[model samples]
Target: NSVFDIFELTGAARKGSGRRLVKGPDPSSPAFRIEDANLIPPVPDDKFQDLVDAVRTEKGFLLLASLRQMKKTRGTLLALERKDHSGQVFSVVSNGKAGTLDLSLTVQGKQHVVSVEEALLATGQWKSITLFVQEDRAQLYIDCEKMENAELDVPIQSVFTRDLASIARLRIAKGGVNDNFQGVLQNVRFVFGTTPEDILRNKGCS
Candidate 1:
């Protein structure tokens, strides 16, 4: 007998696009404010290397990081490439040299970069944002607002190969291009799961 005997349900599940939620005061709302809850850890620059090592061994790793309220440091997230230490598969930074909320992806050693100039237009503050990446695509949703325009939509295919391995590290502003996280990151949830292809079928560029 199998050590783990679990029944599987085979059927058509609801197919829908990705969505974002702002963590705050609203029962009907799915977002939870990270400041109100003690979720993220503030690690020093020296400790980041250790954190990266720990994340590499983690199972079912999916991280939802945010710079919701912190204002002293710049918060950044990086998914490094294991094959090439110098190569990076994904990265997110708030208030970097380029602009506010800069995201970049490296595909097979080639780099594609994007910035959130419009979204950071007036506020100049760190707004809550979520990134969802599957096999061939990635979707970045900001302030619970789904960007319908294709130009602003974040896609992984343009930045990463489908056969790329798992994530390397989830860094919270150690240093480099985008230094410390200058805001608060709250209600960060990490999950290990799979995203259905139907959810990303209509997201690729032509």
Candidate 2:
């Protein structure tokens, strides 16, 4: 034991910090694109850490993902289901393709689920997916282009206001009642009130 200096860990969002082990994560992660999609495989169960501890969801949130679909064909990519109350869930999923993402939200007395696909061309390959949240809606983007029509918005606020913490308790790659994916899913990010382009810039990619 050597005494003299003391070091404390700071929790203030460091450059390569805040990311925790989630489903099908690449050991060398967070790249805007998957360098080799085959290097990482699907995780059969959920791999998420509590998002509330690392993110703020009430003010709107953005999620960016780099993924490659595998043989399993269908599974969740990102999900926030009410594990405790089992009432609400907000999620992004790939039913059986590569680039497409289907959004789902269930809460209160209603359930909202829709694909609102591919304006950015979601296919069975490496693509960038961004879930953009605004005051009235939630938008999905592949690469830089927005998915579906500008007028359509996935239910961002839905009936899940009380299920906010469940957002933190999300499922990555597997689990929950939704389908699961069997490929590489990485660079999972949560940015507040921003677009995918902003994250793209931060990632040093154009």
Candidate 3:
């Protein structure tokens, strides 16, 4: 019933979160702008989906982010990047530490952080976050509930590349490349239907 590779969406002049130029001290904090529009700002909800060269896989990949949140005390859903030269930047943040559910990631080079004890998921709605990896084991699921202890080992890389040091293709929802996922993201899928009897019962880590 599913098969996905790279799916992106949005509408009506809604696709700017790149030309960076932010300066914020207050104003409810969220100074991400590129002349406005990271999608989903047209009136709260009209079906939002934004893309910025989003979704392209290689070397064992999986992610299905369809998120919306509550308890918004700062947000950044996903970002695992490797800039064209100064490479390696990993981030998966929901900034938890006040309720009960928290999630964070990055294993060296992006300051090396690892956090998990998830269940709070902001508690708003529209949450269906599932991530899976194969080479070095990484798994996180929310909709069907599988997020305990947040297992991670991940280092079989390849989200993007050109010739040498690689890792891109992630950076969804917002900007700053890997630190601009502010909040209230959209429905996007990069993984789908991998079987062979779930790879001979290996399961990978999902």
Candidate 4:
């Protein structure tokens, strides 16, 4: 029903708590690499609530991003966690050397994880990654190709409340203390969808 432009399109041009902005891989476009394990802080409370409401009412969600991994081969690209630290709401992680990516989603105390394998991940090349969740299904897409498809034991429901959404923090580039992305990121979009059919219509995260 709606799309949340959760990230700054200009990347590191927007000041963060850590390291200064550096020129991104794309000289032609606005972009920046995250440094010093820094994080792009969570969006406004009302924006997060809107996103949560959209997903709850629509029954599906999509996360799209463009990035290039530099030195570190493995790390968390993004994460959404409950303020109580009870559990993770959703997350995306990548293992460059292994050419594999993990997309995890939690609903009703259950976590569904899907892993997708890719090639040449350590090449430090700019690439596109997309994560999708609808009801009992979860999927991973790399460079517009659907690499992993899995069934979720728990379906996303209205139980994902606005209170939880408002209190929770969505951390970019750092999922845990040491799990931080070492790379350039841009064009991050969190979108709401009506059904599983909506995911099928996705051609890519262009």
TM-score winner: 4
> Residue by residue across 1-206, what tens digits does model 2's lDDT show?
11100000111112333223333434554322222222223222122322332233443457666776654355566565565646436666676644355666665555666665553233456766677765446567666554543222434554335335534344445435535455555656665545657676765565
As a whole number from 0 to 100, the lDDT of residue 189 in candidate 2 is 62
Each prediction's whole-model lDDT (CA): 0.38, 0.48, 0.41, 0.64
Report the CA-based lDDT of candidate 4 relative to the real structure: 0.64
TM-score of each: 0.44, 0.59, 0.25, 0.75
lDDT of 1 by residue, 107-182 (tens): 5556666665533412335454445544333355555554411132444444433334343333333324435344
Give the best candidate by lDDT.
4
Error of 2 at 200 (Å): 3.4
Q: What is the lDDT of candidate 2?
A: 0.48
Alpha carbon deviation, residue 121, candidate 2 (Å): 7.2
Q: What is the lDDT of residue 81 in candidate 1?
A: 34
